[PDB]
Design a protein around this nucleic acid. Structure first.
Ligand SMILES: [Zn+2]
Ligand SMILES: [Zn+2]
Ligand SMILES: [Zn+2]
Ligand SMILES: [Zn+2]
Lengths: 136, 136
RNA sequence: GGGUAGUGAUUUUACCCUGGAG
RNA sequence: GGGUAGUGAUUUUACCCUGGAG
């Protein structure tokens, strides 16, 4: 078992340095409490243009053991959609509701309809009017 | 001499409390060193909708002696244009270049052409690429 | 993403609305 | 107001462009 599936949120990310850590709250479908940190490098972020993650954004990902710890292979939003990125990202506040794509909107989305995800942090467990992250 | 003309910048303003102070750097056209604080109440701000000032924005105003100190009567931006207001003000970042009105833009502005004022703080002494306030 | 306001004398504001739709 | 990017292992980023025009 070399390639594992993980889900969580971004713990922290430094845009300039190009890396940070994910907080894995579920490993291969099983809930982790406490969560386990997974290293993330910008090169592995599923996004349009310049890559970064914002603290607290919901992620789904594949990872592996590395000499330095746990390393993520590909990092997406829940259900394989794109990541949100840094609050300072250009066009970062005009994403399609379905995929997170900066190019269009949900009425023009040709991808299959996705489960509703938080307008602020992409969580599939809550909605923006109840977003613990936005409440900061 | 009851009504005086003054000019300066906003020292501070608390939007919830509805008051703050102006740093008067010129009284009746004559430069002051040190500047003198002038009280300002939201009721006296020349602006469209909910009133507030942001720290550092350039003002012109009329003022008078009050029991508590100096009180401003009317507060405008340089040359009688509208104030900028709190950074959090709805539509606050989409003002006409000539008057600062929220309703339109410089092409459709019918007021006489005004001296060029900073895009960030409305100063008539500098431009945005050299703004000491934005440089914070 | 969007909205509303009002403690008058020295320091940076409080609410609200938003889920098959912008 | 707008743009560009790239230090791989534990903490929130660096530049730039913009003045009779958006
Ligand atoms: Zn889409
Ligand atoms: Zn959320
Ligand atoms: Zn105008
Ligand atoms: Zn300025």
């Amino acid at each position: 078992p070399q390639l594992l599936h993980g889900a969580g949120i971004c713990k922290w990310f430094n845009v300039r340095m190009g890396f940070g850590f994910l907080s894995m709250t579920a490993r291969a479908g099983v809930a982790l409490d406490p969560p386990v940190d997974v290293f993330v490098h910008q090169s592995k972020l599923h996004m349009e243009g310049f890559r970064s993650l914002k603290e607290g954004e919901a992620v789904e990902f594949t990872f592996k053991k590395s000499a330095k710890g746990l390393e993520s292979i590909r990092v997406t939003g829940p259900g394989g959609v794109f990541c949100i990125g840094s609050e300072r990202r250009p066009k970062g506040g005009d994403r399609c509701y379905n995929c997170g794509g900066l190019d269009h909107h949900a009425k023009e989305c040709k991808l299959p309809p996705q489960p509703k995800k938080c307008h602020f942090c992409q969580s599939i467990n809550h909605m923006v009017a109840s977003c613990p992250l936005k409440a900061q």
